[PDB]
Design a protein around this ligand. Structure first.
Ligand SMILES: Nc1nc2c(ncn2[C@@H]2O[C@H](COP(=O)(O)OP(=O)(O)OP(=O)(O)O)[C@@H](O)[C@H]2O)c(=O)[nH]1
Ligand SMILES: Nc1ncnc2c1ncn2[C@@H]1O[C@H](COP(=O)(O)OP(=O)(O)NP(=O)(O)O)[C@@H](O)[C@H]1O
Ligand SMILES: Nc1nc2c(ncn2[C@@H]2O[C@H](COP(=O)(O)OP(=O)(O)O)[C@@H](O)[C@H]2O)c(=O)[nH]1
Ligand SMILES: [Mg+2]
Lengths: 422, 421, 330
């Protein structure tokens, strides 16, 4: 009934900051580790201390210091803290072969210590960046070692994907092509969210013209909280992680769900009116259009005070409003997550104290459209063959690119193929 | 992460004098080596540019090299005169005097190996080298002479390290002798093939910025160094402090360089104004504007390949990227087509002292093709008459050494012609 | 005028049989149409070349087909050049040079066969000749003369005023040759001087670009200088596949970064860019005149038929097919 955490790259560290802060505050853990006066994500020694079942590994020692030298340095044991000595320079090549191969072995050693410390490992969640190098190369090699030792384990991924228009680095489109072969073949479930649409919510619902990373990260943390931490408390219908690979992924190579979660009001919200926002395209957290594609599978997870009996009417209204062109393969694909515990607001956060919350997961053909945004960006730079020498410098040959580009085409068709069948 | 920085030549040794003075005032370290700042983040990455000393002192990890003692003695004479350890001074007499052949091939070569020993001794005591900075001249015989040979031997010893060069381009506007352009063709002849990345600065732009925005009547030569001083700090800023996207030096190199040859860029410091409005978008406008380009060319004449932005202060990238995205749309003709995002953002949390916001510009555009056309024309014109060759011919430099210097130069210039449009 | 482009397929090696890799690529000799595809023979691509070569073909056979007709055209005063390039262990070093060293019948390589075959060609004319050789390897952006005795002098590469495409080399000891015995004693030292290390892909994997040029003057009067560049490049090395932990990994950088520059030279010449960046590699400047100049050049590609190494196989074929559009100035 326990699972561990993996946060690779700068994205993983800063994101997890709010994640564990939530986890620490969700259950009344002090920043020291001493609960005044359940154990799913923590082990408890006899000293009255809790420890997070986390793995924070970074190839640059810059970002880790913020945690281990400021606050929350008592909650962590440096045992888990693994650190590199040089950044991957946003090169999947250097991240995978050059530096990561020299650090990866140290990481695996700490994992078997935790897995044995736990009993009945449910899996682990992956945190990294598809655009960044560290989240591309070091992650990919790391993932491959996991499936070798732990074949029958869940592998969730939260890879923040860059925007079609807004970007931070120039070689971002090159990493995504290399990671596609890595995640799709190995990982069973991966979640792609993009800060662009995350900005859209913060300037529409929160009315905030100064959203920083910390604000966006606290939002992502709430998604992960309800996915696992709430499923560790019983309700009308509790859900597990493993059924998702069967309840949400109706075929082997069909797994890239879309997540939405928008109970965002500044300091009246009826039940059904909240659930409607889960399907509004304007807050889908990824720049796509549900009307462009179709809906394959979709399961919900309700937080706080929710009564299933009158809920069934709201679910029916989704079918009664049938303009979304639901696919034919799954008529009754709605697993309802019913958790009695409500979410909590972190002091100094930008979210209001709600009495009920709903977070949606759904695979669809719309995520295939996000690939169409990327594919052109990659092909143009490959035509002039620019910035390619760096990856050849570390030793990854250009043949990898041609091979990996076809996996993007083949995967994008598979989602298009499902709509044809009727 | 450790980085070694080298000074060479009459001009180069003067420029660093302000540089370290800024870095020392950055962390708040008194000239003698005692630390008296108040910020604890200053000591978080002190290893980058200093070595711990006895009695809790600090030593600037520097190498001071020249062919003339007078210029270097003045540095040790004035403020921060005791901050270096004198053993790092490596020099001799009989300066080259704008004689590249003497500086690179014949005279400095005798002093070259002595410098390599101090370079080699420095690296081993360091944990792990990151990059190599060399401040020198391109038109000055000495700095270009030794510096080019200095880079050749260093890169041969360290292929994995970063060869960043902050050099001064011979300005077509002002110079003391008309023989200065010859050195540049001989300078870059060794640079491109043996350097990872190069920074271009012009004196005309130097006086241009101090005259326009600063509105100073008498621009002193030291105050021009005050401009270039912080520009290098912007490149390093991601290494010292924790930030949102700490773009390391090698990370920055990969973002700009589209091909292992075309690695010349144009720095520029935006937030400088008269005593007279201070917003974050206020920096973005100054960033793209030509009045902050340290090259003697209009960046709008050519087109940009890549642009790196390093911001100093509490800033939301939402306020950045939305402001940044306009530049991609406002001037669509100014960027190439096959690169969708020409921008490289890097947000370091801590700004310099005094100011609350700041911006560090790093851009590689095709405009540099013009700056080298200035040198090539004068070089070819004076080469036809073969005037003042016996000043260089007797030192043991064959004519064909100049011949390749011509074609290999213009090939770099012709490269941007296609990539522009 | 068009550059002749042929392709050869090697047999499966030990590891190709140890990993149990099946044959996915096939050839047709006379039709010169190599058929290649993935594991499941469903969709297949068609590559047309001047000639095809199966795995059972001999070294002298490939020499007879492509290399031999170019031997006789040297005396007209024109330059020729041919080189193999591709994935590691495809068999380039064995094809061009040959593993173990008179007649053009045995498994002897191209280079010592060229010396045996051309020697009678000059003797048949009874012309006055001064033939010399050159053995150099490009290792980590350094020039090392194998044939030279001392080679301590820093070898540079300069341009020329008269010859626009050519480049002047200093320190190349042009030893005259009048007998085949004298050439074999030094050349075997050249491959003894050839820097090689053991890899899991190939225990005799080349570790440097060995550009072996041949030059001979002709006088009988219109003086002529025959030029032939028997180039033996290093192969592309998947740094994870070969296996190394180090000093060897520094070699992989320069070798792999060099081939990448080569391909763009074809990319620019096919799409007809105003200029082509030969300046970024010493290797590119060596073949600068060879690529898009006044020289009848040829290329002999080698590809593994292994299903595993399909990616490098298919990708390498790209530059080979595109090269047929490149023109010259005869
Ligand atoms: N939304 C959001 N994105 C982030 C955050 N932190 C990092 N990222 C993304 O992560 C990308 C870079 O990922 P990383 O690989 O982790 O960066 P790194 O750890 O310094 O390693 P390199 O990319 O190789 O430099 C950036 O482009 C960001 O878009 C964050 O806190 N919030
Ligand atoms: N046609 C062939 N039939 C059988 N064996 C071959 C053939 N071609 C090459 N080989 C063998 O394959 C191995 C590879 O030799 P080699 O020529 O060095 O490969 P390569 O592609 O040139 N890699 P490199 O050594 O770096 O140039 C040697 O043991 C050769 O004897
Ligand atoms: N920015 C700046 N440039 C300088 C300074 N002093 C000299 N220069 C430039 O350096 C160039 C020539 O350098 P030079 O004195 O010949 O260096 P040398 O090779 O050691 O003799 C001149 O064109 C000047 O513009 C200075 O204090 N600051
Ligand atoms: Mg990064």
């Amino acid at each position: 009934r326990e699972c561990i955490s993996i946060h690779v790259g700068q994205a993983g560290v800063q994101i997890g900051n709010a994640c564990w802060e939530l986890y620490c505050l969700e259950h009344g853990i002090q920043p020291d580790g001493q609960m005044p006066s359940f154990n799913t994500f923590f082990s408890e020694t006899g000293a009255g201390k809790h420890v997070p079942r986390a793995v924070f590994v970074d190839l640059e020692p810059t970002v880790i210091d913020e945690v281990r030298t400021g606050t929350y340095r008592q909650l962590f044991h440096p045992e888990q803290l693994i650190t590199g000595k040089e950044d991957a320079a946003n090169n999947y090549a250097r991240g995978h072969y050059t530096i990561g191969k020299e650090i990866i072995d140290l990481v695996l050693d700490r994992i078997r210590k935790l897995a044995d410390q736990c009993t009945g490992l449910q899996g682990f969640s992956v945190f990294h960046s598809f655009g960044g190098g560290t989240g591309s190369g070091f992650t990919s090699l790391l993932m491959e070692r996991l499936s070798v030792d732990y074949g029958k384990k869940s592998k969730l991924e939260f890879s923040i994907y860059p925007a079609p228009q807004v970007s931070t680095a120039v070689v971002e489109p090159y990493n995504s092509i290399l990671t596609t072969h890595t995640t799709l073949e190995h990982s069973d479930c991966a979640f792609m969210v993009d800060n662009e649409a995350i900005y859209d919510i913060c300037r529409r619902n929160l009315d905030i013209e100064r959203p920083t990373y910390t604000n966006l990260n606290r939002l992502i943390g709430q998604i992960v909280s309800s996915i696992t931490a709430s499923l560790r408390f019983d309700g009308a219908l509790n859900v597990d992680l493993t059924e998702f690979q069967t309840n949400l992924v109706p075929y082997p190579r069909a797994h890239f769900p879309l997540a939405t979660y928008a109970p965002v009001i500044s300091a009246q919200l009826s039940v059904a009116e909240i659930t409607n926002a889960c399907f509004e395209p304007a807050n889908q957290m990824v720049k796509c259009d549900p009307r462009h594609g179709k809906y394959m599978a979709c399961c919900l997870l309700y937080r706080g005070d929710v009564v299933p009996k009158d809920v069934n009417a709201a679910i029916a209204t989704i079918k009664t409003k049938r303009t979304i062109q639901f696919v034919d393969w799954c008529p009754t694909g709605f697993k309802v997550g019913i958790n009695y515990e409500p979410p909590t607001v972190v002091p100094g956060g930008d979210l209001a104290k709600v009495q009920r919350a709903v977070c949606m997961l759904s695979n669809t053909t719309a995520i295939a459209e996000a690939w169409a945004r990327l594919d052109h960006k990659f092909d143009l730079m490959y035509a002039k063959r620019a910035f390619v020498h760096w990856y050849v410098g570390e030793g990854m040959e250009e043949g990898e690119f041609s091979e990996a580009r076809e996996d993007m085409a083949a995967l994008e068709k598979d989602y298009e193929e499902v709509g044809v069948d009727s | 992460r450790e980085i070694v920085h080298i000074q060479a030549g009459q001009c180069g040794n003067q420029i660093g004098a302000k540089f370290w003075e800024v870095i020392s005032d950055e962390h708040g370290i008194d000239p003698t080596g005692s630390y008296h700042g108040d910020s604890d983040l200053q000591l978080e990455r002190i290893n980058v540019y200093y070595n711990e000393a006895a009695g809790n002192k600090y030593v600037p990890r520097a190498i001071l090299v020249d062919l003339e003692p007078g210029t270097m003695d003045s540095v040790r004479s004035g403020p921060f005169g005791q901050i270096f350890r004198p053993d790092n001074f490596v020099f001799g007499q009989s300066g080259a005097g704008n004689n590249w052949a003497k500086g690179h091939y014949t005279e400095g070569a005798e002093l070259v190996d002595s410098v390599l020993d101090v370079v080699r001794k420095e690296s081993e005591s360091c944990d792990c080298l990151q990059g190599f900075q060399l401040t020198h001249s391109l038109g000055g015989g000495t700095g270009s002479g030794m510096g080019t040979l200095l880079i050749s031997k260093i890169r041969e010893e360290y292929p994995d390290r970063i060869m960043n060069t902050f050099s001064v381009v011979p300005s077509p506007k002002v110079s003391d002798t008309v023989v200065e352009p010859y050195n540049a063709t001989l300078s870059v002849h060794q640079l491109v093939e043996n350097t990872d990345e190069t920074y271009c600065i012009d004196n005309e732009a130097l006086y241009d910025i101090c005259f326009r925005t600063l509105k100073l009547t008498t621009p002193t030569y030291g105050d021009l160094n005050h401009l270039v001083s912080a520009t290098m700090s912007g490149v390093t800023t991601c290494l010292r402090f924790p930030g949102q996207l700490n773009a390391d030096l090698r990370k920055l190199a990969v973002n700009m360089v589209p091909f292992p040859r075309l690695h010349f860029f144009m720095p520029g410091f935006a937030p400088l104004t008269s005593r007279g409005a201070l917003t974050v978008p206020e920096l973005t406008q100054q960033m793209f504007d030509a009045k902050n380009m340290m090259a003697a060319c209009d960046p709008r004449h050519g087109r940009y390949l890549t642009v790196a932005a390093v911001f100093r202060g509490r800033m939301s990238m939402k306020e950045v990227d939305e402001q940044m995205l306009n530049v991609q749309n406002k001037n669509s003709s100014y960027f190439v087509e096959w690169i969708p995002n020409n921008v490289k953002t890097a947000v370091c949390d801590i700004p310099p002292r005094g100011l609350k916001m700041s911006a560090t510009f790093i851009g590689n555009s095709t405009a540099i093709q013009e700056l080298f056309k200035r040198i090539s024309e004068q070089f070819t014109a004076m080469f036809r008459r073969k005037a003042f060759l016996h000043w260089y011919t007797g030192e043991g430099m064959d004519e064909m050494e100049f011949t390749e210097a011509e074609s290999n130069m213009n090939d770099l210039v012709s490269e941007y012609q296609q990539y522009q449009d | 005028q068009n550059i002749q482009v042929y392709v050869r397929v090697r047999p499966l090696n030990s590891r190709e049989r140890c990993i149990r890799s099946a044959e996915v690529v096939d050839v047709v000799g006379p039709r010169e149409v190599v058929t290649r595809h993935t594991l499941d023979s469903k969709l297949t691509k068609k590559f047309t070349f001047d000639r095809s070569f199966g795995p059972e073909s001999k070294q002298c056979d490939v020499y007879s087909v492509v290399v031999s007709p170019l031997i006789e055209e040297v005396l007209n005063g024109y330059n020729c050049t041919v080189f193999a390039y591709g994935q590691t262990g495809t068999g380039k070093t064995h094809t061009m040079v040959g593993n173990e060293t008179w007649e053009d019948d045995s498994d002897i390589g191209i280079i010592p066969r060229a010396l045996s075959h051309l020697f009678d060609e000059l003797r048949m004319m009874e012309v006055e000749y001064t033939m010399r050789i050159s053995y150099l390897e490009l290792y980590n952006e350094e020039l090392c003369d194998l044939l030279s005795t001392d080679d301590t002098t820093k070898i540079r590469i300069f341009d020329d005023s008269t010859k626009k495409g050519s480049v002047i080399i200093q320190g190349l000891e042009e030893i005259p040759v009048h007998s085949k015995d004298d050439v074999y004693k030094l050349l075997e030292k050249g491959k003894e001087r050839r820097k090689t290390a053991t890899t899991l892909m190939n225990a005799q994997s080349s570790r440097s670009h060995t550009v072996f040029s041949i030059v001979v003057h002709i006088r009988e009067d219109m003086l002529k200088i025959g030029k032939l560049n028997l180039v033996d490049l290093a192969g592309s090395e998947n740094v994870s596949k070969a296996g190394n932990e180090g000093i060897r990994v520094r070699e992989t950088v320069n070798i792999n970064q060099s081939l990448l520059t080569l391909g763009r030279v074809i990319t620019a010449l096919v799409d007809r860019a105003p200029h082509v960046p030969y300046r970024e590699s010493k290797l590119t400047r060596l073949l600068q005149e060879s690529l898009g100049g006044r020289t009848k050049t040829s290329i002999i590609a080698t590809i593994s038929p292994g299903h595993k190494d399909i990616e490098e196989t298919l990708s390498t074929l790209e530059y080979a097919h595109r090269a047929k559009n490149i023109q010259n100035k005869p």
